[PDB]
Amino acid sequence: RERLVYEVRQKCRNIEDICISCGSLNVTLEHPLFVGGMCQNCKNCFLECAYQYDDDGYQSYCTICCGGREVLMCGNNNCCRCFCVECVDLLVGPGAAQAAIKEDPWNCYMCGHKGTYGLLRRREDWPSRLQMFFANNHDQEFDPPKVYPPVPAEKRKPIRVLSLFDGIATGLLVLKDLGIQVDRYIASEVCEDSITVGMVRHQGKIMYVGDVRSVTQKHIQEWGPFDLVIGGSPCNDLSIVNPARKGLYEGTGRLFFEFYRLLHDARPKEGDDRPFFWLFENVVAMGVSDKRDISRFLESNPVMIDAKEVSAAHRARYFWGNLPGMNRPLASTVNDKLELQECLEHGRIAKFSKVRTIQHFPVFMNEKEDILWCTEMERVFGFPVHYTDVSNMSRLARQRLLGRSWSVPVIRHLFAPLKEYFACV
Amino acid sequence: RERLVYEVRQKCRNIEDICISCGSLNVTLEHPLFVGGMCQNCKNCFLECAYQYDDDGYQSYCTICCGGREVLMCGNNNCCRCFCVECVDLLVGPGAAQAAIKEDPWNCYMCGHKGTYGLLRRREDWPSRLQMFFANNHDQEFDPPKVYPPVPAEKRKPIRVLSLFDGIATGLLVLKDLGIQVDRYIASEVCEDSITVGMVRHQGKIMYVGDVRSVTQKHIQEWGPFDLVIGGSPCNDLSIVNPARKGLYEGTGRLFFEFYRLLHDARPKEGDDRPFFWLFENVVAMGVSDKRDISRFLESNPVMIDAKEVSAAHRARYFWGNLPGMNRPLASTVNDKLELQECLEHGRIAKFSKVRTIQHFPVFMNEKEDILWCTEMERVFGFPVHYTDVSNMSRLARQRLLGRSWSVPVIRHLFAPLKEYFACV
Ligand SMILES: Nc1ncnc2c1ncn2[C@@H]1O[C@H](CSCC[C@H](N)C(=O)O)[C@@H](O)[C@H]1O
Numbered sequence: 080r081e082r083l084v085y086e087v088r089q090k091c092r093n094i095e096d097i098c099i100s101c102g103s104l105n106v107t108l109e110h111p112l113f114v115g116g117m118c119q120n121c122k123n124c125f126l127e128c129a130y131q132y133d134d135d136g137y138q139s140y141c142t143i144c145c146g147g148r149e150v151l152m153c154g155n156n157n158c159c160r161c162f163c164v165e166c167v168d169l170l171v172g173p174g175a176a177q178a179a180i181k182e183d184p185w186n187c188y189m190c191g192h193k194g195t196y197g198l199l200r201r202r203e204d205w206p207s208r209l210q211m212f213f214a215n216n217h218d219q220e221f222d223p224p225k226v227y228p229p230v231p232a233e234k235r236k237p238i239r240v241l242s243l244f245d246g247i248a249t250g251l252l253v254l255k256d257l258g259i260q261v262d263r264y265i266a267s268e269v270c271e272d273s274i275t276v277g278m279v280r281h282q283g284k285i286m287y288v289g290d291v292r293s294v295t296q297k298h299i300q301e302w303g304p305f306d307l308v309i310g311g312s313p314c315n316d317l318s319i320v321n322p323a324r325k326g327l328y329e330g331t332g333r334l335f336f337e338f339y340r341l342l343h344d345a346r347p348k349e350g351d352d353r354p355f356f357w358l359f360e361n362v363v364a365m366g367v368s369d370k371r372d373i374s375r376f377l378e379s380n381p382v383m384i385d386a387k388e389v390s391a392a393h394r395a396r397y398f399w400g401n402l403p404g405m406n407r408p409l410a411s412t413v414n415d416k417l418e419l420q421e422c423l424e425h426g427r428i429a430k431f432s433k434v435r436t437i438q439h440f441p442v443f444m445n446e447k448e449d450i451l452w453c454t455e456m457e458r459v460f461g462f463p464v465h466y467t468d469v470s471n472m473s474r475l476a477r478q479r480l481l482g483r484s485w486s487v488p489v490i491r492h493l494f495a496p497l498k499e500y501f502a503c504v
Numbered sequence: 505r506e507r508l509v510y511e512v513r514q515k516c517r518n519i520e521d522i523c524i525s526c527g528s529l530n531v532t533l534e535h536p537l538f539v540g541g542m543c544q545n546c547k548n549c550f551l552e553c554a555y556q557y558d559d560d561g562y563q564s565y566c567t568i569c570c571g572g573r574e575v576l577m578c579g580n581n582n583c584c585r586c587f588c589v590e591c592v593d594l595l596v597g598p599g600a601a602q603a604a605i606k607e608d609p610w611n612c613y614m615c616g617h618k619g620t621y622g623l624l625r626r627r628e629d630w631p632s633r634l635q636m637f638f639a640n641n642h643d644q645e646f647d648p649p650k651v652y653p654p655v656p657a658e659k660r661k662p663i664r665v666l667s668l669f670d671g672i673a674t675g676l677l678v679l680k681d682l683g684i685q686v687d688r689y690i691a692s693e694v695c696e697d698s699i700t701v702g703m704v705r706h707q708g709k710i711m712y713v714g715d716v717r718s719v720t721q722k723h724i725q726e727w728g729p730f731d732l733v734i735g736g737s738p739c740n741d742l743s744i745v746n747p748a749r750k751g752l753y754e755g756t757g758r759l760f761f762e763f764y765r766l767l768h769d770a771r772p773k774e775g776d777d778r779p780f781f782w783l784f785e786n787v788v789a790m791g792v793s794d795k796r797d798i799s800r801f802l803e804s805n806p807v808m809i810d811a812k813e814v815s816a817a818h819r820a821r822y823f824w825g826n827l828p829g830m831n832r833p834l835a836s837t838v839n840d841k842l843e844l845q846e847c848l849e850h851g852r853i854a855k856f857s858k859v860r861t862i863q864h865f866p867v868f869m870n871e872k873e874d875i876l877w878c879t880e881m882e883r884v885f886g887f888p889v890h891y892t893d894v895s896n897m898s899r900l901a902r903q904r905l906l907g908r909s910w911s912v913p914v915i916r917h918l919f920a921p922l923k924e925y926f927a928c929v
């Protein structure tokens with residue numbers, strides 16, 4: 080693309096007529112953040128790569144092209160973006176990257192105070208375009224989810240939940256917080272610590288099953304009709320945060336199908352018009368063909384929901400499902416804490432306003448750099464105070480346990496219209 | 505196990521009380537071919553490894569322990585077994601392997617003419633035990649397939665077939681050979697050569713679809729009710745014959761679920777008691793957890809069927825399904841050719857009686873070593889004479905095309921009782 084952008088700056092080619100990521104001429108889209116066109120292969124790359132972060136908490140690849148060999152990290156607080164040397168040679172000029180390295184307090188171009196440069200200019204409604212960009216994923220066209228008519232209030236009954244990959248029983252907790260009567264809560268999980276957390280916090284009510292692969296269709300039938308089936312595949316191997324990324328499709332992908340199977344096992348037959356609901360959860364840093372196969376099998380379009388809208392964590396997650404109002408915008412109640420500082424312990428001050436979890440140690444306390452405490456990690460994700468202090472487990476394990484979990488106010492947002500279909504306390 | 509077999513030969517321990525594969529004390533089974541016990545981990549290893557062959561046409565690992573670091577290949581004609589140096593040190597004695605290397609015309613212990621040795625003796629009903637060994641896979645317990653009562657002859661109608669991973673239309677060909685009227689034959693396939701083969705040989709009757717992943721439930725509904733859904737996942741990546749074995753679960757495993765999905769899409773509802781039948785096919789050289797997940801999802805027990813019983817090829821394949829009489833023993837009609845020589849062209853003589861396809865070049869013609877000709881490969885698998893000579897394709901591709909296919913008399917054996925449920929020509 081060096082010669083093509085030579086012709087762009089000579090006013091012989093429009094920058095909007097060229098794909099600013101790789102220099103392709105097959106322009107179909109516009110680049111959502113900056114000025115230029117966008118080809119489809121770069122859209123797939125952008126889907127996979129944009130929200131991939133390294134162990135330093137900064138982006139794994141360049142923000143522009145979603146590739147790049149050596150990148151520029153950003154000095155500005157809470158910003159995690161990177162711009163590779165090659166991109167800066169076109170849009171800011173030749174040698175601007177090598178000169179920009181030497182600028183010790185440097186701000187990236189999404190954070191630049193001027194907001195206007197010569198060849199590169201920032202497009203104004205970029206957050207709106209970022210939200211629209213996932214609606215722009217009409218390549219995987221699917222039929223709209225079947226809307227079930229509301230059951231009258233006197234006729235409502237307690238909800239029954241099959242919860243696969245339950246973890247620390249975030250789903251049941253949220254259902255309690257919403258005041259929905261829970262007839263029963265069947266849960267499959269294999270990690271003993273998470274089992275214990277659920278046992279204690281939910282007071283023996285949870286009927287514990289073993290591995291998901293031991294659950295047969297006969298099991299599904301004899302454990303009574305289910306009203307709500309929920310689950311989230313393992314995300315630790317999909318996430319770029321784990322240093323030992325042996326594979327992505329291995330382990331986690333197989334377990335996905337387990338959800339798939341039991342979903343069909345729990346689904347009412349056609350002609351049985353009783354209300355039935357399901358939710359699957361996954362990370363945004365995933366493969367495109369992976370995401371397609373998931374969308375193909377669950378026969379639906381993903382919704383991306385980021386917890387930043389309602390909580391103090393960057394937690395962007397896909398939610399497939401047929402719960403009513405899964406698309407509607409997220410509202411943050413006053414109880415929710417949109418600033419990191421409100422979630423800290425007294426005596427601590429946060430330089431950060433959000434913690435990126437999908438400047439390693441986020442806290443300045445007594446002029447020293449510390450990790451968030453376990454009870455604060457609970458407060459960040461919306462869990463009740465001292466939620467995971469049940470058994471005698473190490474801090475590393477307990478942090479890990481909290482880290483995998485669903486963001487509580489997001490899950491409250493999703494589960495809230497179920498109150499219109501089931502009984503209240 | 506060296507010290508344990510020291511105590512075995514001192515008449516202080518029974519060889520039947522020790523696992524002769526790895527020396528484990530957790531004896532649950534008996535070794536099917538030879539004298540000793542067998543632990544469960546070695547059973548899983550034996551399931552994965554026994555029918556794995558290298559590119560030389562001989563076994564990938566030792567026959568005894570299904571491991572081994574350096575193996576002894578067998579001199580006897582058509583025998584492909586290998587025995588590693590370590591195994592021969594216990595059962596035949598120390599240094600017997602190094603001395604046995606020096607014996608230039610050497611026979612392995614499954615082929616030895618005496619049939620009786622000191623520590624190792626061959627158990628007599630080993631083929632019967634080999635057949636029973638797959639019935640011995642009761643670890644994956646499942647309910648018996650639902651038997652549908654026979655429809656009266658006057659009421660019978662033409663069969664409708666959804667055929668995924670169709671290849672060269674072996675299924676429709678076999679249905680024609682059985683004289684079953686075929687209302688329609690919907691087929692998904694992506695390889696153009698195989699499409700062409702089916703087009704020509706089946707005279708435009710086949711309605712060709714694209715990739716299986718583009719077939720929706722709506723497609724399944726609007727293409728009319730299906731009476732028979734069949735398919736076999738890609739086996740080239742699972743097979744050890746391809747040198748570039750990057751993975752086994754990638755590509756082929758994902759495509760398996762496609763079958764799974766469309767099967768549920770094509771299945772009649774409960775309460776609709778109309779006859780419906782399905783068949784899935786796969787190779788025997790596969791992983792145990794892979795085989796378990798397949799058995800879990802199709803909710804059935806595999807049947808292993810080897811084509812040697814009815815054809816001139818070693819073609820051991822798993823068949824899941826609910827077709828009546830899928831367990832019953834295979835009969836070879838006089839038309840079928842149990843000897844390789846009958847399948848050769850005139851002027852050729854086969855040293856081999858069977859061709860192992862899952863001394864590379866199987867034929868001595870004019871005192872020279874040659875590959876089987878394409879028309880003979882067709883004759884080996886039971887295809888009609890000159891079946892794949894349709895378009896202008898290379899020999900390597902055309903052999904490959906034939907190689908993937910289902911064995912015709914095996915498929916005839918499976919499909920034969922469908923004549924009791926549908927209309928005849
Ligand atoms: N085979 C298996 N069966 C059930 N759970 C499993 C499993 N393998 C891994 N898991 C669990 O699946 C979870 C995935 S992340 C769980 C998030 C959950 N929604 C929460 O709020 O905590 C992990 O806790 C892991 O322990």
Ligand SMILES: Nc1ncnc2c1ncn2[C@@H]1O[C@H](CSCC[C@H](N)C(=O)O)[C@@H](O)[C@H]1O
Nearest residue numbers: 669671672674693694695716738908909910
């Ligand atoms: N995505 C896909 N959709 C349909 N077929 C595919 C496919 N990917 C690979 N295949 C085909 O699946 C076949 C698997 S082996 C086919 C055997 C078949 N029963 C026969 O008699 O020939 C291959 O021919 C391969 O071309």
Ligand SMILES: [Zn+2]
Nearest residue numbers: 098101118121
């Ligand atoms: Zn591009």
Ligand SMILES: [Zn+2]
Nearest residue numbers: 141144147163
């Ligand atoms: Zn870049």
Ligand SMILES: [Zn+2]
Nearest residue numbers: 153158187190
């Ligand atoms: Zn910045």
Ligand SMILES: [Zn+2]
Nearest residue numbers: 523526543546
């Ligand atoms: Zn053993």
Ligand SMILES: [Zn+2]
Nearest residue numbers: 566569572588
């Ligand atoms: Zn061995």
Ligand SMILES: [Zn+2]
Nearest residue numbers: 578583612615
């Ligand atoms: Zn032999």
